[PDB]
């Protein structure tokens, strides 16, 4: 399965995952490619904010599906 995750600057990288992988690993793939610490990654698939303890399957991710890295900011 080949999914895509869009960076916080809308870069969008392609990643290989099998429905059996944990969200936790999807982040490692991202880091591996972009150098984005999994610590500061927040993934979002169709509204749901992916828990890195569940599996890609858990969120009905399928090949073409696109995930988004997101954030919330403190200052004002």
């Amino acid at each position: 399965m080949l999914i895509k995750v869009k960076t916080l600057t809308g870069k969008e990288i392609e990643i290989d995952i099998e429905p059996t992988d944990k969200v936790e690993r999807i982040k490692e793939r991202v880091e591996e490619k972009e150098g984005i610490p999994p610590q500061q990654q927040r993934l979002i698939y169709s509204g749901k904010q992916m828990n890195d303890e569940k599996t890609a399957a858990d969120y009905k991710i399928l090949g073409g599906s696109v995930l988004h890295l997101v954030l919330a900011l403190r200052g004002g």
Partner: protein, 516 residues
Amino acid sequence: KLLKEQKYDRQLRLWGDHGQEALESAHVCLINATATGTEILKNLVLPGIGSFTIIDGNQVSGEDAGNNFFLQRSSIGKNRAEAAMEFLQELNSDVSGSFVEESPENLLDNDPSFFCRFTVVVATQLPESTSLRLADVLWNSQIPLLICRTYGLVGYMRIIIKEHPVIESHPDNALEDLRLDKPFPELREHFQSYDHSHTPWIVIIAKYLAQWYSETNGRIPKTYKEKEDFRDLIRQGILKPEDEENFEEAIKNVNTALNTTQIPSSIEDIFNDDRCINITKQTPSFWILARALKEFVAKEGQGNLPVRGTIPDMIADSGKYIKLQNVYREKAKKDAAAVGNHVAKLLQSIGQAPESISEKELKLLCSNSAFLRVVRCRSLAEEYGLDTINKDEIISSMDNPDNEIVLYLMLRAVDRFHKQQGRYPGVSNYQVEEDIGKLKSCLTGFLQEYGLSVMVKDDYVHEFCRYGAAEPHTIAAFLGGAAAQEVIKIITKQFVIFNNTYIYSGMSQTSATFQL
């Protein structure tokens, strides 16, 4: 003097002192002083932009004072350029304001060369004619132009710079140039040179990496496995079960540290550009440095860019970390000198003084060798041209009846309508009814004139008529903020500018960048 550094601290932490210098030395030209222009300029005066000049021929109207935070009732009837200049002036005494009580068109006629004074030109709420004309004049004059427009709940923004190179790209997140996969002598010697938690995780990975290399000759690709197995190799080394936090840390970095050396695709392209390949006395600083970088790669770089010379922090003995850190720092310093040589030679073969390029420039380039970026915008003419119109992009995007590019098309139609009807759709309440048709006619006329086989919901034709070409402050304000920063990027050359047309929909609170 030092009072400034106190006032600008929050932003100096973003573009540093040199950025601030660039900014305080620039001179910006804002065309129309409407809310959009006024807001954009507001976000530039505050930061401390050198000086600005407002060119507006219009008179402040009632609705003008109504949506502009820099025009009061007391200034209705006076010149909109002068009026705004006074209020904006108040935001920062370190900024010098000026104004020209004439129209863009007027200036483009009686004196085109006028705009060569400006670092950048920001034009707002202009009609097709004036844009195309101004875009043209400035394109030839080599002046950066940013066309901004607020129409209803739609924010339009198109940037036009022939070529904009940037060294200090400022990337959020990048990979570390640790290069364990292709270590350099000094680095290797350092590793050989080898309180269990006091040992840098890199040295740890290097050790077990060396071992694995003997029992294999392998580098450890096989993601899913080899790396996972390489971890278990590290685990079988933790002091009789003592703890080892850094060890476990190394195990986590294994997902990164393995392959961290390879020339970026974007840089390959810079290297391959004609501007880099064929140098001349004309060739600007940036490209000469790019060539020097390429030359380096070929020779002493041995396949890769200069070593960055910066490593991440890592749980480790105070002195051990600092020693490790110097290995890179020192190496980096060397690669820099090498690149420096290639520069001088290149400069000489061109006739320029070996010192035509500062050491500061050199050092910075080498740090960002892996993040250089070049942006080139299509001329406004190429976009509006019948043959050059990038219809591939338009049609493609339109696959979604609600892709922000609907708004672009509608803006072209509204423009057609204006050119045609001599006024904008639905400005007066009673006109709405009638114009909804007249507008769709222009939409279709526009789509046919370019052969754009696209479906545009009739809803959008309605909406734009509802807009009555209004310039809602909250919309103008959004644009004002985004535009100002792009302008600051142009001036400081410190970040990456969007490529061509940016479209914001206040309706859906979404936006997208198009073309290129």
